[PDB]
Swiss-Prot record, chains A, B:
Domain Ig-like C2-type intervals: 105-202
Keyword Endoplasmic reticulum among record annotations: no
Species of provenance: Homo sapiens (Human)
Biological role: Cell surface pattern recognition receptor that senses endogenous stress signals with a broad ligand repertoire including advanced glycation end products, S100 proteins, high-mobility group box 1 protein/HMGB1, amyloid beta/APP oligomers, nucleic acids, histones, phospholipids and glycosaminoglycans. Advanced glycosylation end products are nonenzymatically glycosylated proteins which accumulate in vascular tissue in aging and at an accelerated rate in diabetes.
The protein's name: Advanced glycosylation end product-specific receptor
This protein's UniProt keywords: Cell membrane, Cell projection, Disulfide bond, DNA damage, DNA repair, DNA replication, DNA-binding, Endosome, Glycoprotein, Immunoglobulin domain, Inflammatory response, Membrane, Nucleus, Phagocytosis, Phosphoprotein, Receptor, Repeat, RNA-binding, Secreted, Signal, Transmembrane, Transmembrane helix, Ubl conjugation
Inducing or repressing factors: Induced in T cells by antigen stimulation and by the S100B ligand. Induced in trophoblasts by DNA damage.
GO molecular function list: advanced glycation end-product receptor activity; amyloid-beta binding; DNA binding; histone binding; identical protein binding; laminin receptor activity; molecular adaptor activity; protein-containing complex binding
Whole-protein coverage range: 23 to 231 of 404
């Protein structure tokens, strides 16, 4: 599309979008246009408001668009077009992407005993409540574990909450420890969000014992 | 009072205040308490809402307090008290101060001719639409002009808009130019807001001719 300001809105939280170039108070010649999961192509919202959209998004006195609680279906394009007292036309363009942070990831069914030279199920990492899905990754003593390599194998699984649409991730790690290695390695798991500039969450490490 | 987070809210703009430690969605055991120009001591606001206060401030689904258009009377203390699913009590304390930026200051009735050795009316600086009042200051070639020093005299005036309560400032500068000075000095005027970390606004300079 066109050049836009990217907005990352957290699910459940309010969102205010500024209509640039609008008078600070009524009277106002402005209109918002949005194309989201809630619309069939473009929907026009006006200061006068009215109808079902009043429960989703309303134009504020200063012309900004206000959404009291952002949802998954509010992802999309939000545009404002305004005329000021001097007659200049000003346009605002926002690309809104929504997200939710999962709870802290947890390692379940961890092994306490690993045999070197044979495949071993190390553990299962679980992360619940993310949007977008994001990914789970494993770490050995700080170094990321690369799947399908040095005897490392990972299986992954994704479920969706039937009501909220938030994602639960599950990742099982299997390793074949090399003969003559660290007898007490430290394994950990991290959740990486799908969105840029978002922090990664890490589990408490597990430290099984290995048989050389 | 108690330790608080300072909030500077612009008049006419929405304000969202987070209720820390609250569940992200209803059901919620929280309450807001506010003491502002609108209240007689403390007023309690609840998620259920209702009554005239619904037109001024409402608790959002995530527990935050939302004011669609802040006014002068909204200055004051805003507190939230919340219990989470684990039973921990969390308190939020906000000291809200409101403001409005005036229009660009202007010099009117500026003189084109100053006689050195006698008092001369240099000009009158005008700033309209500020809250809080703020102050007007004069500058000679970048250097601030200190009133009642070196033949400098300033007279000041403050008016209030009868409906909006915003302030209009007026400042008249008189100087006695020293014999043997800059034949074309540059005078300017600046508005300094009453609130900290807010930028100063400066007028276009005036450059009269001075009389040796
Ligand atoms: O209500 C009106 O008269 C009015 C609405 C509106 C929306 C965008 C532009 I550019 C001018 C406008 N004028
Ligand atoms: O009338 C409106 O709401 C409106 C239309 C429109 C077209 C391109 C861009 I960038 C912003 C816009 N805003
Ligand atoms: O029924 C109500 O009290 C009520 C719901 C609702 C949804 C979005 C907006 I903006 C204002 C609202 N008021
Ligand atoms: O002027 C008013 O009373 C007023 C208008 C208006 C529009 C959207 C929302 I959310 C709150 C509002 N309050
Ligand atoms: O009656 C209720 O449900 C209720 C409200 C409320 C507000 C703050 C705190 I700490 C506990 C609370 N319990
Ligand atoms: O125009 C309306 O129906 C309307 C007024 C109004 C005042 C405060 C809040 I929070 C929401 C509002 N909606
Ligand atoms: O979940 C609730 O009780 C609740 C809905 C809702 C919609 C608009 C506004 I402003 C405040 C709200 N609070
Ligand atoms: O109702 C109360 O007793 C009460 C609530 C509340 C919220 C924040 C702070 I700092 C002090 C408080 N006292
Ligand atoms: Cl539609
Ligand atoms: Cl009261």
């Amino acid at each position: 599309g066109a050049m836009a300001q990217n907005i990352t809105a957290r699910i459940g939280e309010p969102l205010v979008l500024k209509c640039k170039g609008a008078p600070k108070k009524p009277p106002q010649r402005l209109e918002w246009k949005l194309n989201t999961g809630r619309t069939e192509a473009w929907k026009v919202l006006s200061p006068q408001g009215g109808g079902p959209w009043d429960s989703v998004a309303r134009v504020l006195p200063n012309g900004s668009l206000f959404l009291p609680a952002v949802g998954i279906q509010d992802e999309g394009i939000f545009r404002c077009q305004a005329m000021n007292r001097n007659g200049k036309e000003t346009k605002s363009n926002y690309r809104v992407r929504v997200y939710q942070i999962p709870g802290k990831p947890e390692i379940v069914d961890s092994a306490s005993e690993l045999t070197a030279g044979v495949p071993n199920k190390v553990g299962t990492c679980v992360s619940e409540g993310s949007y977008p899905a994001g990914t789970l990754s494993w770490h050995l003593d700080g170094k990321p574990l690369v799947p399908n390599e040095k005897g490392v194998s990972v299986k992954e699984q994704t479920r969706r909450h039937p009501e909220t649409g938030l994602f639960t991730l599950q990742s099982e790690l299997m390793v074949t420890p090399a003969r003559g290695g660290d007898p007490r390695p430290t394994f950990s798991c991290s959740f990486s969000p799908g969105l840029p500039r978002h922090r990664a969450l890490r589990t408490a490490p597990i430290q099984p014992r290995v048989w050389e």
